[PDB]
Design a protein around this ligand. Sequence first.
Ligand SMILES: [Ca+2]
Ligand SMILES: [Ca+2]
Lengths: 149, 21
Amino acid sequence: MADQLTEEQIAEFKEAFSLFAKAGAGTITTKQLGTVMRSLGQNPTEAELQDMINEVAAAGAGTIDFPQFLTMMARKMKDTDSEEEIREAFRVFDKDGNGYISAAELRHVMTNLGEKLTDEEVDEMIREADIDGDGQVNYEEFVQMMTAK
Amino acid sequence: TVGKFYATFLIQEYFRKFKKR
Ligand SMILES: [Ca+2]
Ligand SMILES: [Ca+2]
């Protein structure tokens, strides 16, 4: 099942994971894992790595293959289709048709579904987000503030 | 039915959550 995906990564990703070790090749071990993941580029905290290295292990040794190595690093960013989906919702929110949500619009979505939600939370939300000092929020800050947890 | 139903699932979750102060 193809769905379009970057390539520059898979290219360099394999290279590093391919050129390394010494007594053999094909896969890396816990220790070698970090080594390859390090030269790879980014160098965030080591916590995430630790857990993973111990999570991949399962019915077998600690040697990891390249296919699983990329899947993990790739999953780190979390892959989930949500483009058009959010776009559609964008139209439902905005009423003027543009690239910036306004209070009036936001309130509309609320009062519509009901759930009370007085106009108090609305102004409060704008005070929390808002990239600039504008009583409006761009599609970016909008999506960046959406998807909670 | 793949449609706007999904949009609700999203706006719904975020709402019920950020609800409290
Ligand atoms: Ca607007
Ligand atoms: Ca803004």
